[PDB]
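Notes, p. 3: input format for complexes.
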Amino acid sequence: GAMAPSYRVKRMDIAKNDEECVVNAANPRGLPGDGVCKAVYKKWPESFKNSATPVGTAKTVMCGTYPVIHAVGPNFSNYTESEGDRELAAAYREVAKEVTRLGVNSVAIPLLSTGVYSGGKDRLTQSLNHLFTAMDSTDADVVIYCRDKEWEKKISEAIQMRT
Ligand SMILES: C[C@H](C(=O)O)[C@@H](NC(=O)c1ncnc2[nH]ccc12)c1ccc(Br)cc1
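Output follows (163 residues plus A1AMU):
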């Protein structure tokens, strides 16, 4: 594990992360997809072999020796608020289990179920809180990657508020 496990946020492409493994905001079918998923596909295409997995789960596939953890968050256009919230929390718990199993000292992670899976709602606080609930008991350094400029400031404030 990391010597002093921490949380950090960076506004940049997760495909260019400086961590020991990456979490993909995957679709359930293991398709190249769009946004984060497409960037992950362009960088580690070999990791998409048999990467299909149900909503609320995570499946790791190695690209060489670099682990890609395909985490499938719910699309809130399809799920109710209650059922979607439960699947989103579950997807993050499965990511924590995989990060622990892999023995990595750091992990790059995006905010699951935001953007096109958000059902047109701002889900920064909801997704980030579920990320903390799952990762708080792990000892990996967590680096959150985002694209929205207002989101970088909000995530940074949320991390600092807890320290
Ligand atoms: C809404 C969120 C953000 O702005 O942080 C967005 N992130 C991104 O697209 C994004 N964030 C980090 N590295 C990236 N590389 C290429 C894209 C990209 C995102 C949308 C939908 C889902 Br599901 C998950 C994440």
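The chain has one domain: 1-163.
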